[PDB]
Design a protein around this ligand. Structure first.
Ligand SMILES: Nc1ccn([C@@H]2O[C@H](COP(=O)(O)O)[C@@H](O)[C@H]2O)c(=O)n1
Ligand SMILES: *[C@@H]1O[C@H](CO)[C@@H](O)[C@H](O)[C@H]1NC(C)=O
Length: 246
């Protein structure tokens, strides 16, 4: 398992958490020095438990699929909550079984559905460590509309930060003040599958992407990433979604 406590949290302790999160995900191979997530894992081993504590020390446990870093569901006191999707229902067979009741959330975990439930796109939702404290607090007591927004914050401040060093750094900048994600942040989130694919396709293509990936950079400018020498590949991305799952 991995843990993170908002009480006394700073950019350093958050960095240690994201490091732990990455290191908890198994791999047998690196592609261009980036860990390649496994095609599949059977049984309970598929799910990582993240213990998150709000400033007041109240806690939720979040179940994460270690093959794609997708959040499946979470436990809050004696109630488990899972996304309305087949992968999450499968997860509910293995994690939080001792919960007194299980609620299936009225949406899947994908960004489009969460934004619909939350009533706003995540371009408009501030993120940061204070926002994560709020998210944990919200998830402690069921409120599906509020939970959608909280989960958008949760996913970006954990999974997306694990996937991209840039995103980790953006959250570190928001340690004591929330701010909506940069356009570059949104771009990287939306491009993770594509980038993972092209980095793997480059393996037998002399480091060249079969299809270029369009990204927005730190200056709001639209760049085109075409091979593994790009900083996004050498610097930024920390985990690759296996092409078998794409
Ligand atoms: N169970 C799920 C499903 C999706 N997600 C996140 O939501 C995204 C899906 O968004 P779209 O369907 O809008 O592409 C994924 O990239 C993933 O990071 C998640 O964190 N947990
Ligand atoms: C590869 O990407 C680098 C970095 O963006 C770029 O400068 C260069 O033009 C590209 N080279 C090839 C052969 O695609």
């Amino acid at each position: 398992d991995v843990s993170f406590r908002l009480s006394g949290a700073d950019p350093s302790s958050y960095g240690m958490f994201i490091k732990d999160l990455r290191n908890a995900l198994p791999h047998t191979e690196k592609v261009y020095n980036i860990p390649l997530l496994l095609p599949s894992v059977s049984g309970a081993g598929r799910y990582l438990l993240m213990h998150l504590f709000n400033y007041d020390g109240n806690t939720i446990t979040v179940a994460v699929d270690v093959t794609n870093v997708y959040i499946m569901g979470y436990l809050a006191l004696t109630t488990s909550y899972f996304f309305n999707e087949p992968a999450a229902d499968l997860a509910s067979q293995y994690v939080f079984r001792s919960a007194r009741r299980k609620i299936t959330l009225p949406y899947s975990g994908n960004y489009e559905r969460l934004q619909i439930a939350a009533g706003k796109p995540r371009e408009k939702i501030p993120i940061g460590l204070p926002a994560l404290d709020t998210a944990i607090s919200t998830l402690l007591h069921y409120d599906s509309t509020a939970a959608a927004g909280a989960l958008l914050v949760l996913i970006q401040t954990t999974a997306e930060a694990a996937r991209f060093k840039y995103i980790e750094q953006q959250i570190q900048e928001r340690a004591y003040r929330d701010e909506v994600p940069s356009s570059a942040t949104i771009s990287l989130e939306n491009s993770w599958s594509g980038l993972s694919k092209q980095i793997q396709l480059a393996q037998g293509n002399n480091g060249v992407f079969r299809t270029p990936t369009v990204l927005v950079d730190s200056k709001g400018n639209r760049v085109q990433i075409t091979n593994v020498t790009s900083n996004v590949v050498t610097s930024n991305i920390q985990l690759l979604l296996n092409t078998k799952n794409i």
